[PDB]
Amino acid sequence: RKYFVAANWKCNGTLESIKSLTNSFNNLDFDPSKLDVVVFPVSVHYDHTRKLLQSKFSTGIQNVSKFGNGSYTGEVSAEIAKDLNIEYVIIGHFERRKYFHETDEDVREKLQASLKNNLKAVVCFGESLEQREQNKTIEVITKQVKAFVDLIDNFDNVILVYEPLFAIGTGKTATPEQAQLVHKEIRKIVKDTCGEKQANQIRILYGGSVNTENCSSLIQQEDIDGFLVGNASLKESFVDIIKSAM
Amino acid sequence: RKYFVAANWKCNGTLESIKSLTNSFNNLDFDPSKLDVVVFPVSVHYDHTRKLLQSKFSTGIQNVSKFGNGSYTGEVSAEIAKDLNIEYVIIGHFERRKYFHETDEDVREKLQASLKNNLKAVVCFGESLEQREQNKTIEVITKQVKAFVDLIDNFDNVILVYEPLFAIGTGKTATPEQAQLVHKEIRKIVKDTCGEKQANQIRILYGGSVNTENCSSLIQQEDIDGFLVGNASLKESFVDIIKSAM
Numbered sequence: 036r037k038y039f040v041a042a043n044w045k046c047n048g049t050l051e052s053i054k055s056l057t058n059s060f061n062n063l064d065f066d067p068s069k070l071d072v073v074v075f076p077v078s079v080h081y082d083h084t085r086k087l088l089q090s091k092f093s094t095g096i097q098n099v100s101k102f103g104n105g106s107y108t109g110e111v112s113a114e115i116a117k118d119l120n121i122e123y124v125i126i127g128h129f130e131r132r133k134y135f136h137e138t139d140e141d142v143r144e145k146l147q148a149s150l151k152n153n154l155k156a157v158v159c160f161g162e163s164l165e166q167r168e169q170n171k172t173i174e175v176i177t178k179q180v181k182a183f184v185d186l187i188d189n190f191d192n193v194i195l196v197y198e199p200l201f202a203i204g205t206g207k208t209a210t211p212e213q214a215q216l217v218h219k220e221i222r223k224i225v226k227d228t229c230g231e232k233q234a235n236q237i238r239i240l241y242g243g244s245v246n247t248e249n250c251s252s253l254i255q256q257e258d259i260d261g262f263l264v265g266n267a268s269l270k271e272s273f274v275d276i277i278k279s280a281m
Numbered sequence: 282r283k284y285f286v287a288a289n290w291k292c293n294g295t296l297e298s299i300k301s302l303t304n305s306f307n308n309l310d311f312d313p314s315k316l317d318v319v320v321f322p323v324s325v326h327y328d329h330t331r332k333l334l335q336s337k338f339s340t341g342i343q344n345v346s347k348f349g350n351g352s353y354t355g356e357v358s359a360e361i362a363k364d365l366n367i368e369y370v371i372i373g374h375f376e377r378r379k380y381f382h383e384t385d386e387d388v389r390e391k392l393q394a395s396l397k398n399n400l401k402a403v404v405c406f407g408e409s410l411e412q413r414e415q416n417k418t419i420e421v422i423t424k425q426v427k428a429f430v431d432l433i434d435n436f437d438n439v440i441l442v443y444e445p446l447f448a449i450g451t452g453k454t455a456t457p458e459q460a461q462l463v464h465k466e467i468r469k470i471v472k473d474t475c476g477e478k479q480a481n482q483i484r485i486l487y488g489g490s491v492n493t494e495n496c497s498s499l500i501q502q503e504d505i506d507g508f509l510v511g512n513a514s515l516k517e518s519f520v521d522i523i524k525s526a527m
């Protein structure tokens with residue numbers, strides 16, 4: 036499996052900081068045929084970032100609409116995306132499930148619209164702190180994954196991301212072992228419902244807090260194929276997180 | 282009052298159709314100091330559209346976030362908008378209230394974030410078909426307006442838009458008279474809660490279906506100061522709607 040390292044800038048950035056940040060990123064020398072590195076800027080920053088990042092870096096948007104072109108003020112459709120040649124899109128990030136009540140149904144439809152338009156998808160899912168304490172982690176994960184996994188046709192174009200919400204912002208910590216356990220169960224769910232060749236091909240990223248110090252012990256895990264970095268991706272030291280996967 | 286004519290492209294467009302459409306728009310000769318004409322493209326199309334449209338045309342985005350910079354995947358903040366020099370933003374469009382459950386609280390917060398960052402706002406509100414039949418039109422509007430009207434400081438930078446939802450997609454038609462009545466009640470709500478100089482200064486646009494044939498009889502109304510055009514703005518004949526307000 037080809038490692039995958041994504042930078043989710045979320046809602047941050049100014050024309051200037053981005054110029055500076057990309058300038059750092061460009062310096063890192065790596066083979067894009069051996070590693071996937073994707074940068075997800077704010078929609079209105081897409082063109083700007085794309086012109087500054089060299090071809091070795093892929094780019095994409097943080098969200099895609101579940102509807103197609105039409106009367107949907109404020110949305111961006113997979114079609115619009117395809118036309119601009121955006122390559123990846125993030126789907127189901129917990130922040131959207133939390134503040135915008137995006138449901139598993141939305142996730143499914145968005146994924147469908149994306150695949151139909153030849154977009155690659157970074158699909159997110161994970162259990163809450165409350166669900167983890169109730170030992171429902173696997174039950175929850177299974178449900179969420181089984182909500183869209185059947186729509187996956189090409190397992191090189193859909194990247195799954197496990198976002199242990201429970202650890203993110205609660206004073207908790209997901210250890211390389213804990214994550215490796217779930218990453219194994221997810222991969223098993225794919226195997227049982229899509230076949231082995233597929234399960235061994237699909238990539239499952241860790242989406243909890245990742246930084247220059249813990250990235251190595253994470254990428255080392257068997258079923259962890261890279262990550263979806265958050266705040267760390269806003270620093271120049273992000274290049275080291277990439278190096279950890281070279 | 283300086284007339285206002287806005288083009289809400291919603292979720293439509295391709296790099297090519299936009300080049301063609303703007304080419305048409307550019308041809309129309311008008312004085313921007315006498316008339317406000319604003320185009321709202323898809324976020325990912327903003328730069329492209331802005332480079333093609335001549336200075337006489339203002340541009341803005343279809344939606345703005347209620348949060349500031351930070352962990353809000355998929356959102357665009359007023360701060361980021363300001364940095365890019367985006368001038369206007371649409372807030373509360375019924376399509377967002379309908380499909381994304383944006384509430385009057387979201388509208389207030391979004392408006393606040395916008396004003397704090399020196400952005401001009403196009404605020405939308407309107408009653409449903411069901412509420413109109415129950416003769417609750419004035420009641421509903423008053424509520425929605427009284428949800429943010431106090432935050433208005435500079436009455437040249439906030440444009441109110443009445444979107445008679447009822448007439449949009451039900452087989453109903455809002456006559457120039459019907460709209461003119463509501464526009465009068467809205468302006469009175471501003472007068473009683475913000476004063477006369479303000480009420481007489483703020484622009485109140487009509488948001489129902491507008492086309493080359495009914496625009497004139499609408500702009501003629503006393504309390505109608507322009508419009509927020511939808512599908513008609515996707516045609517080259519949109520220039521005639523502009524002319525109707527010159």
Ligand SMILES: O=P(O)(O)OC(CO)CO
Nearest residue numbers: 243244245263264265266
């Ligand atoms: O938790 P942080 O520091 O915001 O960053 C993330 C995710 O959201 C790490 O992959």
Ligand SMILES: O=P(O)(O)OC(CO)CO
Nearest residue numbers: 489490491509510511512
């Ligand atoms: O109803 P249409 O044709 O989509 O256009 C609109 C609004 O949404 C007219 O201002």
